[PDB]
Ligand binder design. Structure first.
Ligand SMILES: Nc1ncnc2c1ncn2[C@@H]1O[C@H](COP(=O)(O)OP(=O)(O)NP(=O)(O)O)[C@@H](O)[C@H]1O
Ligand SMILES: [Mg+2]
Length: 291
């Protein structure tokens, strides 16, 4: 059945130290801490430590390990990075790049007027560019997320937004659990079809999440009713004071016909100029890899 083969990603648990908890995960408590020599020319690094509770069986601890391993394949500045693993011995761990600000959704709800500035067009274009960049990288690497949502993106100390670690199981498909209707494309709801295009659809919804400081998409309607609405050409409303240009993107990512929607590279291409100066140096888009 299940088995985990140790590899070069292994790290000595003596190099890892946990200061405090960040939050409960699917397999157990997630902590914050420090790891030595997990980054090039970096003696120590602050990291996120995912663990599995003692109550966990072998299969679970192994499943935890094989799931975290999907991230071994990826290396993008705009995708949260795996830094190591501790499979040998009890407190099965996984060391991840630390995103001090949490998931994008929680970060957006945090600016809720209920005293910092909301996000300005400039700020939003940045997050969108970063998210689109990590998605273009992933799609370029034959992977279809299938569960892109603000809650699945993470925010770094310097406010850089990245795509959180994911699970997996031709184009590989991510996604795990009961997929949420409010982020699904019409063709996904109708035929169960997932593509780079339906990832773009979901992208438009997170732009809408951003623009609404994370309101519930199709708020007021049941998922059951959303299923039909969306399949019927129904779309989300233009947020109260949403920048025209921002809503333009949304509308294009929401073309009923998948082929009519832009790719993440085309999304980026059309907003790259409104990106920060550093983008050119860290982006997949401007990387040698993109071609
Ligand atoms: N890389 C990270 N940086 C900062 N915080 C993190 C990080 N990864 C997870 N967390 C936090 O830990 C808690 C659990 O997060 P969660 O995203 O649900 O992980 P999980 O255990 O993989 N389950 P799920 O992602 O729902 O399948 C939350 O409080 C997160 O903010
Ligand atoms: Mg998660």
């Amino acid at each position: 059945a299940d088995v985990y083969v140790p590899d070069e990603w292994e790290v000595a648990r003596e190099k890892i130290t946990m200061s405090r908890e960040l939050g409960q995960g699917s397999f157990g408590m997630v902590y914050e801490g420090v790891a030595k020599g997990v980054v090039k020319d970096e003696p120590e690094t602050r990291v996120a430590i995912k663990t599995v509770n003692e109550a966990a069986s072998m299969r679970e601890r192994i499943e935890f390990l094989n799931e975290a391993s999907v991230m071994k394949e990826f290396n993008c500045h705009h995708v949260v990075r795996l830094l190591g693993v501790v499979s040998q011995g009890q407190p099965t761990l996984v060391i991840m790049e630390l995103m001090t600000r949490g998931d994008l959704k929680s970060y957006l709800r945090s600016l809720r007027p209920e005293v910092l500035a909301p996000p300005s067009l400039s700020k939003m274009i940045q997050m969108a560019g970063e998210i689109a960049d990590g998605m273009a990288y992933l799609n370029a690497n034959k992977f279809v997320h299938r569960d892109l949502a603000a809650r699945n993106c993470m925010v770094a100390e310097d406010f850089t937004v990245k795509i959180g670690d994911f699970g997996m199981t031709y184009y590989r498909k991510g996604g795990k659990g009961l997929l949420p209707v409010r982020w699904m494309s019409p063709e996904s709801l109708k035929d169960g079809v997932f593509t780079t295009y339906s990832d773009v659809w979901s992208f438009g919804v997170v732009l809408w999440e951003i623009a609404t400081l994370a309101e519930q998409p199709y708020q007021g309607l049941s998922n059951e009713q959303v299923l039909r609405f969306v399949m019927e050409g129904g779309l989300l409303d233009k947020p109260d004071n949403c920048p025209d240009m921002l809503f333009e993107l949304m509308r294009m990512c929401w073309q009923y016909n998948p082929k009519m929607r832009p790719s993440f590279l085309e999304i980026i291409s059309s907003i790259k100029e409104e990106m920060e100066p550093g983008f050119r140096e860290v982006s997949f888009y401007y990387s040698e890899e993109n071609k």
